[PDB]
């Protein structure tokens, strides 16, 4: 089992531990659970979903990277698929606060990127900051998203975000997790195509600047991120971050990053380039290439 | 009167117009009103503060810069001083969504930077996004801040941000607008010192990386911004933005920017440098210098 889970795992309940140990066994346990696993989990313990999710939090939080805060936050997004995706915050020393990733964004994009069509609920070990409540309201699940916090009843997003601002305010009709395909031709090597492919699924109704980032690991593994705009602009999820979320959740570490490509239009109104390299360099990867969309 | 106000002004009520015209007369009307002016305003019209603020919105919104959205948002922060500060959103073509400024952040930092000790209320022509509700909760006014929106009753922040996350969650005791002075020696030319001075008032309890940006205009005017962290990290106000807010509100335009300096520690965990130049270049200023704090 991935050491990141060591401690957490140890404070889990005996029957839960047993049910889990087989799954967590793999270092490369993908920080996710299929329906089937959930069911199994539910039988070995007498937990109901909600209780199960709360019970897994600490594992989701085990994946956090917080050199600054030291404030571990885990989240679990529940697919309409039955799959549960873990999420955890990340802070990058050498960059800016604007580069940070919240547990919630982590889980939701984990899910989105993985192909999930919609979420039903999300569970966090801490009340969501306003930045995340706003991030949440961009999804096709709307104000209905259900949110579970420890020691609280469940509530819909609408309750956490009264009189909310969202895509409708801007006359935006396509929501995050809705089906998208911008249609750019994939070209170049693998990495280039992984980037372009991500740019293709990007959510960018406000600025109309598609973008994607793909990261190649030592072992030739390839994690890629899609750009995700937000109505309030600022909470937008830059493409780099997408990739790093996957990369981390999945058991990898920065240093395993071999090379990275970024794809975008040259003439787009918004430009990912600088923030991408910068942060990437901050992480120690100077191998950045960019590919121009068309 | 600054053309930016032309249209707005024209749809104001006759008695309000009259009361205003003398003030708005100056191109360099500083997008702000002293107590005295407010009083005068109140007498010429029979308005009460709240109604007065709602009535001035469109002027606050006249100051917006929205090449992307085209979504003008104005805000008015009311000092405990009796001074009212205007605010408006800004979007920068060529940068990223994370560089955007919300009307609310604009007003609050307008006030903060101007020396305001605390706010009593804020009025916006649109419901605040979650990013701003979060930004608001960093102030020393806490959940008590009062918020006025058109067609709604007033409410405290707590109402817009139920079960909120904030500085206390991180054990942070110094709030934004509280009195701060990091104690760096001012040095170099004017610009350098303006930068350092700003770095000195910066709010950075989470990362501990002070920073400041000062901009010199053609005419030798100098606008400077202070760094403002936020508990949720992301909503943090980078130092550059500070300066540009003032610069815009005050009647200036990008192209009047002559040179700019940024001050920060070299070894800080967070680094403003890249985002600063980048955006600055995006705006057409390549004249960036950095000064190392100590
Ligand atoms: O991850 C979350 N989610 C919740 O909305 C609130 C806060 N945090 C975060 O937890 C840390 C403290 O702000 C940061 O890494 C920031 O991303
Ligand atoms: O300025 C605000 N304040 C409110 O919290 C909500 C939205 N906007 C903004 O208005 C525009 C649309 O998102 C952007 O410039 C963004 O900064
Ligand atoms: Zn958050
Ligand atoms: Zn806002």
* Token digits of residue A89: 């915050």
CA-CA-CA-CA torsion for A107, B68, A162, B53, nearest 10 degrees? 150
Instruction: Convert A224-261 into a string of H (helix), E (strand) and C (coil).
Output: EEECECCCCCCCCECHHHHHHHHHHHCCCCHHHEEEEE
- Only one residue has tokens 């960093």, namely B138
CA–CA dist B292, B139 (Å, integer): 28
Instruction: Collapse the DSSP code of A16 into the 3-class scheme (helix H, G, I; strand E, B; otherwise coil) and give the result.
Output: helix
Number of CB atoms found within 10 A of residue A171's CB = 8
Residues near B118 by Cβ (< 8 Å), separated by ≥ 6? B79, B80, B139, B140, B141, B177
User: Which residue in B84, B83, B64, B82 sits closest to B74, CA to CA?
Assistant: B64
Backbone angles phi, psi at B120, to 5 degrees: -105, -35
Q: Look at the alpha carbons of A30, A34, A39, A40 in this order and tell me if their dihedral is positive or negative.
A: negative
Instruction: Report the distance separating Cα A264 and Cα B100, nearest Å.
Output: 20
**Contacts with A260 (C-beta within 8 Å, 6 or more apart), sequence order:** A191, A213, A214, A215, A216, A243, A280, A285, A287, A288, A289
Task: Tell me whether strands B74-79 and B84-88 are parallel, antiparallel or unpaired.
Answer: antiparallel
What separation in angstroms does the CA of B208 have from each of A285, B43, B139? 25, 47, 18
Other CB atoms within 10 A of residue A220 CB: 8
CB B103 less than 6 A from any atom of ligand 2: yes
> Using CB atoms within 10 A of its CB, is residue B268 exposed (0-12), middle (13-18) or buried (19+)?
middle
Distance (Å) from CA B285 to ligand 1 centroid: 34
Could you please report the per-residue DSSP string of chain B? --GGGHHHHHTS-HHHHHHHTTTTTSTT--SEE-HHHHHHHHHHS---HHHHHHHHHHHHHHT-B-TTT----EEEEEETTS-EEEEE-B--TTS-GGG-B-HHHHHHHHHHHTT---EEEEEESSPPPHHHHHHHTTBTTGGG-EEE-TTS--EEHHHHSTT---GGGGT--PPBTS-----PPP-SSHHHHHHHHHHHH-B-TTT---EEEEEEETTS-EEEEE-B--TTSTT-B-HHHHHHHHHHHTT--GGGEEEEEEEE-TT-SS--HHHHHHHHHHTT---EEEEE--
Q: Are A130 and A156 in contact (CB under 8 A)?
A: no
Instruction: For A19-39, give the DSSP string.
Output: HHTTTTTSTT--SEE-HHHHH
Token code pair at residue A147: 């949110």
Contact by Cβ (8 Å): B209, B264: yes
Residues near B242 by Cβ (< 8 Å), separated by ≥ 6? B109, B113, B198, B213, B224, B225, B226, B227, B228
Q: Is B6 exposed, middle or buried (0-12, 13-18, 19+ CB in 10 A)?
A: exposed
Tokens of B287: 């004249």
- Alpha-carbon distances, residue A62 vs A33, A251, B207 (angstroms): 16, 11, 22
Pocket of ligand 1 (CB under 6 A): A 66, 69, 71, 73, 89, 91, 100, 102-104, 126, 128-129, 132; B 165, 231-233
Integer Cα distance of A165 and A168 in angstroms: 8
| Helices B35-44 + B49-62 axis angle, to 10 | 110
Residue B291 CB partners (closer than 8 Å, separation 6+): B187, B188, B192, B195, B196, B261, B262, B263
Strands B74-79 and B288-292, bridge-based pairing: unpaired
Four-point Cα dihedral A173, A178, A183, A186, nearest 10: 150
Residue of B97, B169, B231 lying closest to A233 (CB–CB): B97
Asked if A8 contacts A61 with a C-beta cutoff of 8 angstroms, the reply is yes
Question: Tokens representing A49?
Answer: 């979903």
Reading the block at residue A186, the tokens are 């994939």
The DSSP annotation for B102-138 comes to -HHHHHHHHHHHTT---EEEEEESSPPPHHHHHHHTT
Element (H, E) at A191: helix A190-201
Nearest to A11 by CA among A47, A70, A58: A58
Q: Is B281 exposed, middle or buried (0-12, 13-18, 19+ CB in 10 A)?
A: middle
Q: How far apart are CA A294 and CA B269, in angstroms?
A: 38
Resolution (A): 2.3
Residue A41 host element (H or E): helix A35-44
Token pair, residue A235, equals 């909470």
Q: How far is CA A238 from CA A6, A105, A264, in A?
A: 31, 11, 12
Method by which this entry was solved: X-ray
Q: Is A152 helix (H, G, I), strand (E, B) or coil?
A: coil
A151 in contact with B at a CB cutoff of 8 Å?
Answer: no
B52 close to B33: Cβ distance less than 8 angstroms = no
Please, what's the b/e burial string for A102-133 (b: 16 or more CB within 10 A of its CB; e: otherwise)?
A: bbbbbbbbbbbbeebebbebbbbbbbbbbbbb
DSSP class of A1: -
Instruction: Collect all residues with Cβ–Cβ distance below 8 Å to A291 and sequence separation of at least 6.
Output: A187, A188, A192, A195, A196, A261, A262, A263
Say how far apart CA A165 and CA A75 lie, in whole Å: 23
Q: B50: Cβ below 6 Å to ligand 2? A: no
Asked whether the beta carbons of A55 and A47 are under 8 A apart, the reply is yes
Q: Select from A72, A99, A98, A71 the least CA-distant residue to A86.
A: A72
Alpha-carbon gap, residue B113 to A13, rounded angstroms? 52
Question: Could you tell me whether strands B84-88 and B222-226 are parallel, antiparallel, or unpaired per DSSP bridges?
Answer: unpaired
Query: What is the rounded CA–CA span in Å between residue A127 and residue B208?
Result: 24
Alpha-carbon distances of A5 from A44, B39, B146, B192, rounded to whole Å: 20, 63, 44, 48
Angstrom CA distances, A274 to A214, A281, A288, stand at 16, 10, 11
The tokens of A86 are what?
A: 């873990």
Contact (CB, 8 A) for B247 and B274: no
Return the best residue to mutate from A103, A105, A160, A161 for the ligand 1 pocket (most ligand atoms within 8 A of CB).
A103
Question: A104 an active-site residue?
Answer: yes
Superfamily of domain A180-294: Cytidine Deaminase, domain 2 (3.40.140.10)
CA of A58, closest CA in chain B: separation in Å? 18
Residues 6+ apart with CB under 8 A from A288: A259, A260, A261, A262, A276, A277, A280, A281
| Rounded CA separation B196/B264 (Å) | 8
Question: Could you tell me which residues are beta bridge partners of residue B224?
Answer: B214
**Where exactly does CATH 3.40.140.10 map onto chain A?**
1-179, 180-294
Edge-to-edge order in the sheet of strand A257-264? A222-226, A211-217, A257-264, A288-292
**CA B235 to chain CA centroid, nearest Å:** 13
Residues B157/B135, Cβ–Cβ less than 8 Å: no
Do residues A200 and A179 lie in contact, with contact meaning Cβ atoms separated by under 8 Å? no
* Residue A170: CA count within 13 A, CB half-sphere: 24
The DSSP letter of residue A169 is G
Chain A residues near residue B149 by CB distance under 8 angstroms: 163
Q: Which residue of B has its CA nearest to A130?
A: B130
CATH 3.40.50.1820 fits B1-179, yes or no: no
Joined together, the tokens standing for residue A233 give 């602009």
Parallel, antiparallel, or unpaired: how do β-strands B257-264 and B222-226 relate?
A: unpaired
Say if residues B252 and B157 touch (Cβ distance below 8 Å). Answer: no
| Beta carbons within 8 Å of A264's beta carbon, 6+ residues apart | A199, A209, A210, A211, A212, A271, A272, A273, A290, A292, A293
- What part of B 217-246 touches A (C-beta under 8 Å)? 229-236, 238
What secondary structure letter does DSSP report for A94? Answer: T
For the record, the structure tokens of A279 come out as: 């942060």
B204 close to B144: Cβ distance less than 8 angstroms: no
CB atoms within 10 A of CB A21: 12
B41 within 8 A of B47, measured Cβ to Cβ = yes
User: Which residues of chain B does A234 touch, with a Cβ-Cβ cutoff of 8 Å?
Assistant: 97-98, 100, 102, 129, 131, 234-235
Joined tokens for residue B186: 């001012």
How far apart, in whole angstroms, are the C-alpha atoms of residue A214 and residue B182?
Answer: 41
CA distance A141 to B148: 29
Report helix angle A239-249 to A190-201, nearest 10.
Answer: 110
CB of B95 within 8 A of CB of B277? Answer: no
B236-259: buried (b, 16+ CB within 10 Å) or exposed (e) per residue?
bbbbbbbbbbbbbbbbbebeebbe
Q: How many residues does chain B have?
A: 294
Report d(CA B206, CA B110) in Å as an integer. 22
Alpha-carbon distance B191 to B213, whole Å?
9
The answer to whether A120 and A66 have CB atoms below 8 angstroms apart is: no
Give B36's contacts (C-beta < 8 A, 6+ positions apart). none
Exposed, middle or buried, A223 (CB in 10 Å: 0-12/13-18/19+)? buried
């Amino acid at each position: 089992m991935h050491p990141r889970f060591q401690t957490a795992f140890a404070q889990l309940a005996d029957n839960l531990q047993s049910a889990l140990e087989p799954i967590l066994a793999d270092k490369y346990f993908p920080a996710l659970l299929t329906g089937e696993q959930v069911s199994s989990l539910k039988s070995a313990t007498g937990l109901d979903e909600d209780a199960l999710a709360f019970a897994l939090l600490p594992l989701a939080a085990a994946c956090a990277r917080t050199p600054l805060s030291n404030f571990n936050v885990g989240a679990i997004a529940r697919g309409v698929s039955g799959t549960w995706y873990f999420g955890a915050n990340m802070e990058f020393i050498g960059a800016t606060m604007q580069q940070t990733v919240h547990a919630e964004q982590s889980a939701i994009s984990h899910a989105w990127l993985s192909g999930e069509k919609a979420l039903a609920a999300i569970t966090v070990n801490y009340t969501p900051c306003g930045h995340c409540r706003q991030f949440m309201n961009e999804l096709n699940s709307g104000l209905d998203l259900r949110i579970h916090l420890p020691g609280r009843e469940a509530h819909a997003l609408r309750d956490y975000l009264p009189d909310a601002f969202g895509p409708k305010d801007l006359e935006i009709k396509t929501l995050l997790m809705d089906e998208q395909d911008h249609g750019y031709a994939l070209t170049g090597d693998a990495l280039s195509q992984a980037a372009i492919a991500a740019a293709n699924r990007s959510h960018m109704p406000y600025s109309k600047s598609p973008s994607g980032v793909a990261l190649e690991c030592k072992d030739g593994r390839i994690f890629s991120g899609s750009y995700a705009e937000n109505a309030a602009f600022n909470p937008t999820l830059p493409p780099l971050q997408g990739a790093l979320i996957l990369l981390n959740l999945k058991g990898y570490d920065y240093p395993d990053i071999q090379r990275a490509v970024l794809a975008e239009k040259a003439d787009a109104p918004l430009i990912q380039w600088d923030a991408t390299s910068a942060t990437l360099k901050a992480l120690g990867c100077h191998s950045i290439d960019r590919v121009l969309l068309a």
